[PDB]
């Protein structure tokens, strides 16, 4: 065995563990989610596991979807000098075209044999795994300050008397047993002798700190396009209440969509409809209020 504990400022190591674990957790959660936002009229007719596509797109490798046996299996694809042949690395096994491939972008609208590359972002300047590191430390220390604020927001009622058995019988039989009408000696024995340590310099501070945590989440959120935007259009709470500057959050949402524009180039080739929409739906009540067809009653209940 080996044991000799520090003190009870162990909490001052537990506090910094909460901050450190919050940064690690929020960082890898936020990129645990971020490669699924778009999902684009999900599997109309096309054999793509789009989850495996979007995970590949957020490590910035240019995937290439084409035909394999007329059914659109993904492949990897790493002034205008045109690409034609299957020179690139190919991830499937025997489903390779073994024939004339092409990029279907500008050779014509809708004619050439399909192997179209899809960028994550049309013009690439900085990776957004750096922006997610940029705010999560700032977010980490505001989560530190919230946790440190509510950890010292606890309150005792200090009794103050010369020690051995004068005031103990008082609080036992007449405060925590709830008793009104306790009788005492005239020796100033509650003339502000019992005192309260309060932290009312802490609870007005508490709510404003939560609002700073909240709008910093929103200021990370609208950067990476994930937004509450369309419902904010129909709710009429459009500007300076949701302090987000709508023209910037509809801006950063749009760059990721027109990065995945070459799926429309593919969609024009084989005669089908694939639009890169932007997912904001969460179900069992939204699907109920949009239909209210009695077959949807036998589906849910």
């Amino acid at each position: 065995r080996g044991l000799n504990v520090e003190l009870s400022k162990e909490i001052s190591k537990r506090v910094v563990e909460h901050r450190n674990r919050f940064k690690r957790l929020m960082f890898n959660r936020y990129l645990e989610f971020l490669p699924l936002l778009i999902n684009y009229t999900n599997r109309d007719t096309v054999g793509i596991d789009f989850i495996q596509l979007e995970s590949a797109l957020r490590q910035n490798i240019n995937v290439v979807v084409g035909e394999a046996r007329n059914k659109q299996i993904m492949i990897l694809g790493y002034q205008k000098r045109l690409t034609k042949e299957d020179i690139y690395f190919i991830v499937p096994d025997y489903l390779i075209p073994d024939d004339c491939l092409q990029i279907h972008k500008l050779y014509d609208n809708c004619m050439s044999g399909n192997f179209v590359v899809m960028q994550n972002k049309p013009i690439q300047y900085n990776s957004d795994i750096e922006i997610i590191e940029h705010y999560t430390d700032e977010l980490a220390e505001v989560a530190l300050s919230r946790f440190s604020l509510i950890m010292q927001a606890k309150f005792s009622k200090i009794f103050k008397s010369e020690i051995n058995d004068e005031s103990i019988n008082q609080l036992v039989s007449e405060i925590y047993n709830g008793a009104p009408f306790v009788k005492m000696s005239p020796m100033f024995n509650a003339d502000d002798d019992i005192i309260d340590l309060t932290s009312n310099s802490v609870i007005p501070a508490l709510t404003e700190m939560k609002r700073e945590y909240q709008n910093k989440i929103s200021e990370l959120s609208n950067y990476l396009g994930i937004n509450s935007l369309a419902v904010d259009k129909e709710s009429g709470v459009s500007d300076e209440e949701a302090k987000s500057n709508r023209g910037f959050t509809t801006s950063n949402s749009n760059i990721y969509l027109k990065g995945r524009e070459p799926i429309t180039f593919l969609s024009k080739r084989y005669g089908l409809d694939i639009k890169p929409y932007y997912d904001d739906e969460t179900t069992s009540k939204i699907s109920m209020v949009d239909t209210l067809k009695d077959e949807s009653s036998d589906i849910n209940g």
Partner: peptide
């Protein structure tokens, strides 16, 4: 879909041929 199915059958037949002369 039928055309795709036919294409798949043709491909499988070709693959089968490419392994045995019979």
């Amino acid at each position: 879909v039928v055309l795709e199915q036919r294409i798949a059958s043709l491909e499988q037949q070709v693959t089968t041929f490419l392994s045995s002369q019979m």
